[PDB]
Structure formats: C-alpha cells, structure tokens
C-alpha cells in the first residue's frame, strides 16, 4: 500500500491492456468473436503448473508485481518468428505475433495470476519457459510443401 512505483507499473500494464482491447475490438474482430485458433494452450499449461507444484491449499504467494510484469514483457519479446536486427525484420516479427501477444497479456494478468491462478515463483518461471518452448515448437518447418 502506497508504493508509487508499483502503481506506475500497474498503470502501464492497464494502459497496455486497454490498448489491446481497443485494437482487438475496433480493427481485428468487429463482430466481437473471442474464440479463435491460436497456438499454445495456455489453460492446459496453467493447470499443469498447478498440478505439478501443488498450487492448492491457499498458501500466500511470494511472487512480486515487478517480477511478474518484467517476466511477461520479456516473454512477449522472446517469441521469435523471424530473426535479425533489420528494421523490416523487427517490424514483421512484431506484426506476426500481435494476436498471440494480446492473448498472453490477457491471460497472464496480475490479478488473474495472484487471486485466481495463485502461481508462485517456481510455477511462474516454469510457465514462462514452457510457453516459450511450446511457441518455438509450433512454427512451420522450412521446406514444407504447403
């Protein structure tokens, strides 16, 4: 209570979520459909993490807000579809993962992680690593005769 810096971080996260809301509603899905085919089942990963580390029995979480925010942002910057430091390559990589980034930021919110999912430090790190690995495994292999 009273922490200004954490309040600023949460305000930035909420602004990002509001921007994602506006971009999804006004540009991508005008009709309002929310169910779409996307890679990496986040719900299955979350429940697997809950089962593995026994996230039951209502024990207070040791996860901190800056850790969660920084981990989510870093994961959103590590979803490599295209590699290289070219400006066009970076722009295309940013464009190609907009919807998946919106999904990840919507699912892994601070309140949802703490109040609802009740992940701890180990569970959160395992979830981030599993999401990164599974997204890397979901790319199309070059040379596919599509």
């Amino acid at each position: 209570l009273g922490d200004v810096e954490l309040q600023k971080e949460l305000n930035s996260e909420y602004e990002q979520l509001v921007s994602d809301r506006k971009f999804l509603r006004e540009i991508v899905f005008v009709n309002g459909d929310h169910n779409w085919p996307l890679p990496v089942n986040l719900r299955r990963i979350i429940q697997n993490a809950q089962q593995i580390f026994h996230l039951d029995r209502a024990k207070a979480s040791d996860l901190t807000i800056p850790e969660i925010i920084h981990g989510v942002r870093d994961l959103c910057k590590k979803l490599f579809v295209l590699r290289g430091e070219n400006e066009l390559i970076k722009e295309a990589q940013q464009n190609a993962t907009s919807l998946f980034q919106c999904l990840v930021r919507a699912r892994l919110a601070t309140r949802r992680i703490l109040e609802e999912f009740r992940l701890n430090r180990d569970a959160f790190e395992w979830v981030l690593g599993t999401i990164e690995a599974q997204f890397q495994r979901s790319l199309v292999h070059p040379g596919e005769m599509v």
């Binding site: 590699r83 290289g84 390559i89 890397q136 790319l139 292999h141 070059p142 040379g143």
Partner: protein
C-alpha cells in the same frame, strides 16, 4: 562470395524434421557401409538406432547447408543445432 557469416546467420537454430530425417538416413547409410562409429555400441545392431544415439549426443559429423532463395547459404553444424 555467397556464404553468410556465422554471426550474421538468421535462420532457425532448431533442427527441422526434414533435416533430422536426412541426417539420420545419411548416418545410417554411412554406418551400414563400415564407417567408424563415434559412440559406443552396447547391444544394438540397427544402423538407424546407432544414428539416433549419435544424434542424441550431438556426435554427428555433418554440416547442413541451408540455401536461401536468392542463392546464398548458411552453414550449420549438427552440434550447434538444438534437438528437441
């Protein structure tokens, strides 16, 4: 004149399924025709099993040349490629 620098490589660092299949087939052929074996043989006799054992330990002495559409190529060692 067409090779890409190692630090400038931009392709994926993982071993694609086609690359894995070709590497396993080539290694199995080479072992079948009496090439030296880089990994100890416990009881197996199938060349494909030996090739898979070598691949699991990153003991494949082969280099993939991934050809870019323009004509340039990238050289990737089978040791430096991530295998799931």
């Amino acid at each position: 004149e067409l090779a890409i620098l190692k630090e400038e490589r931009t392709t994926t660092p993982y071993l694609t399924k086609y690359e894995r299949a070709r590497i396993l087939g080539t290694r199995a052929l080479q072992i079948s025709m009496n090439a030296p074996v880089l990994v100890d043989i416990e009881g197996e006799t199938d060349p494909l099993q030996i090739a898979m054992k070598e691949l699991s330990q990153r003991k494949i002495p082969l280099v993939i040349r991934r050809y870019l559409p323009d004509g340039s190529y990238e050289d990737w060692g089978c040791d430096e490629l991530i295998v799931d």
